Design a protein around this ligand. Structure first.
Ligand SMILES: CN/C(N)=[N+](/O)CCC[C@H](N)C(=O)[O-]
Ligand SMILES: CN/C(N)=[N+](/O)CCC[C@H](N)C(=O)[O-]
Ligand SMILES: [Fe+3]
Ligand SMILES: [Fe+3]
Lengths: 456, 454
């Protein structure tokens, strides 16, 4: 038997493999803000990927940096090669893209880089979450206010816009509802397998399928339900939460983490749906369809009790107390990700609402640079009409200054500024944004100021 | 600027090395026993032979029961099954290291890198075995689809009916004990009304795996995966793997739609024959509930598949998908033919062991007359060196010089070979051996066609 060479992929070889995956034409920059009923095109900004360091895994303070957003986008695309999608309008005329996404090559290239991407995406959780007995576990589960999202949306300068931005964050999860969970039903194991399957079944009648109900919610507020129309408006943290469940479902060494996360999500579901129904009704009035959420507003309309009694209990008995720390870890990791999502979304809404003031704030920041309060690297850019900078973020504060021409500066769904000669905008660290050129040519500068407040 | 795309490429020595890399995980090394003992993480891939196979030369149908094809089928089963959840019947306690060796980032990535090449090797021949359509002509075709069956003939014609039937039943263990797992692969995602129709079929599969457990146990077999790994025929793995292939690779979704229609439409006849044959072989003691769940004509999802899956998909996605639907049906039918042949051949081979032990004498004598010039391998193996099951691409003569060998030809099919004895080993037939003396000295003569030595 030849010696086993352990799997290894790092450094330049890893960078090249990531670029190889992501340079498939279906991943190149979109010329528009939206994907138009084409579930095979996902914007991975492959031109930036050669310049990121995938070997240096970020901690929590840096997980909203651009490299993390880039990796979350990559991971979503890799996981979704296992999911079936067809366009709403049918496959006719989209066969080439279908075959580009579902190909032996696209799968193999993505699967080769998946281990490194998962370390980059989830490695920080090792430091955010810390032997057990059946006794300790029972106490723990037993021990488990206006929410951050409610505050963000209800306090917004534009409540309807803020709520629409919120709703599109759920498109990949709710429109493919239960897909990551279904990954745990394949195979051959104990009575717990049928219990898992029961939960999945709840999430074959198409009209009552929960994804169909969420389609109606989106359509009732003027949004569309084709995946991934709103790709460029998906926040880092939203992708992270969705990806976490594909991670747990695909990687069966993490099965017991999923068991924990299932218990916690089912136990929290009714409160989540009640709040969602209330908030949406307050924002949109009679016209919003909240049936997706009201399917679970009755106190017993969840699978939490069954998860504890028919999944956790039999698994601990069968497989021993060694699995308990994994159950707890799934719960605690998921709770960390929820915190990150609340922060990221709140920050994004504030950033969208502040655009007029951040356009004005360009003036004193630009003046500060002239006075030499900060010595800021400058990038000088010249871009033609319709060069659409697909959405991204930067790791420090940046000042965008227009020398000549006209730019549409995009900060969120329904959140835009028109920047003309001599105008600009303060771009806040980690905030999702993009731009398009509206004149024949636009000449502009990006100044890397670090902390814009030092220029004031 | 966007860097140029380097197309995915893996072939030649790099591919061989990658296959060996995957398969040298300790959980894949040769078993010291004939059976896996309630450990679903250990699968025998005979990694020591893998460096010497040519994965670039894709076999045609005449060669798909050759050893390289068996080796690739074993590899593919293991690669696909990393996506399936298994725990031991006795629980995970004491098997955690193997659990983590199978479900690891490395094991998955190594298997996925080689999956494209393995699938070309496994299924490439179908391109030449199966050859624009309209909704009209598809209807005519489906309408045109339809005497002991080959399996009935093989089992009821056997020298040992109970043994033949047990050998048959273990072939289904990976499929039936994980029932509907490959089909479940098609329900993930977001597509039309057909998604919910697919899901309904999956739901419809007491859970059926539990019923098959009872069938196995009623005839003295065990239901832990993969106890009987070394007795799984090439063709059985091929049939199971085909459905994981269709389910994992969504460019093949429409092939799966066709294969679903055909399997549902053939299910009742299959189950009726299985029930009758098992009752004849075993009498009152066999539990056939797994099969009698589907002995009623038209009580399958065939009509729904045609009206609620095929029809809406053709309307939505166009007539371009129709040839793929047909191809799934025709490919599956080819694989069934191969399975019928392979299983029939294996049962005949098991039943003929006493004659093939006697036939060693004239074949060995023929080699002395100078009838065939045959390459000879001279082997010396200690007690308990268990040659995990495999096959050869030509007929081989095994001759024992000294010591004692258990020569294994199938489940419950064994010969004891002593000094001066041996056996004719028929090409493509699954077999192995164990050494029962302190040392056994023996010879393998590559005779090609043993009949030329007579
Ligand atoms: C308004 N521009 C901006 N925020 N940039 O980061 C520069 C964009 C540079 C280039 N068009 C791209 O998409 O990378
Ligand atoms: C009875 N022996 C036999 N049929 N062989 O092919 C050779 C056995 C060679 C070696 N033990 C192996 O497992 O490959
Ligand atoms: Fe930018
Ligand atoms: Fe042999």
């Amino acid at each position: 038997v030849p010696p086993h060479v352990p799997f290894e992929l790092s450094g330049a070889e890893l960078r090249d493999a990531i670029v190889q995956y992501a340079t498939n034409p279906i991943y190149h920059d979109n010329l528009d803000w939206l994907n138009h009923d084409n579930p095979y095109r996902r914007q991975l900004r492959p031109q930036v990927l050669p310049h990121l360091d995938y070997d240096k895994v970020p901690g929590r303070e840096n997980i909203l940096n651009y490299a993390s957003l880039a990796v979350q986008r990559l991971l979503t695309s890799v996981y979704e090669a296992d999911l079936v999608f067809f366009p709403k309008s049918g496959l006719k005329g989209k066969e080439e893209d279908f075959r580009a996404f579902y190909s032996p090559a696209n799968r193999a290239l993505g699967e080769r880089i998946r281990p490194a991407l998962e370390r980059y995406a989830f490695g920080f959780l090792d430091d955010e979450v810390e032997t057990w007995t059946a006794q300790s576990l029972d106490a723990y589960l037993d021990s488990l206010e206006q929410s951050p999202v409610e505050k963000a949306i209800l306090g917004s300068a534009d409540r309807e816009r803020a709520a629409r931005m919120w709703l599109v964050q759920f498109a990949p999860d709710f429109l493919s509802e239960a897909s990551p969970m279904m990954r745990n039903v394949l195979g051959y194991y104990g009575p717990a397998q049928s219990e898992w399957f029961k939960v999945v079944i709840d999430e074959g009648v198409h009209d009552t399928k929960h994804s169909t109900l969420f389609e109606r919610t989106l359509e009732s507020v003027g949004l569309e339900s084709d995946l991934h129309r709103y790709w460029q408006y998906y926040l880092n943290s939203s992708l992270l939460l969705n990806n976490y469940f594909h991670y747990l479902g695909k990687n069966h060494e993490l099965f017991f983490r999923y068991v924990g996360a299932l218990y916690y999500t089912e136990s929290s579901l009714v409160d989540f749906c009640r709040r969602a129904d209330h908030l949406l009704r307050e924002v949109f009035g009679d016209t919003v369809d909240t049936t997706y959420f009201t399917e679970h507003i009755h106190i017993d309309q969840h699978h939490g009790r069954m998860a504890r009694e028919k999944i956790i209990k039999p698994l601990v008995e069968a497989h021993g107390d060694g699995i308990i720390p994994e159950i707890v870890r799934g719960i605690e990791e998921y709770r960390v990700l929820l915190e990150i999502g609340d922060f990221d979304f709140s920050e994004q809404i504030a950033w969208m609402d502040a655009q007029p003031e951040l356009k004005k704030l360009h003036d004193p920041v630009f003046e500060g640079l002239k006075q030499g309060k900060v010595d800021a690297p400058v990038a000088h850019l010249v871009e033609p009409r319709g060069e659409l900078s697909n959405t991204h973020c930067h790791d420090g504060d940046e000042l965008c200054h227009i020398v000549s021409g006209t730019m549409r500066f995009e900060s969120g769904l329904g959140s835009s500024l028109t920047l003309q000669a001599g105008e600009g905008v303060v771009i806040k660290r980690n905030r999702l944004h993009g731009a398009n050129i509206e004149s024949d040519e636009c000449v502009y500068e990006i100044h890397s100021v670090g902390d814009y407040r030092k220029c004031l």
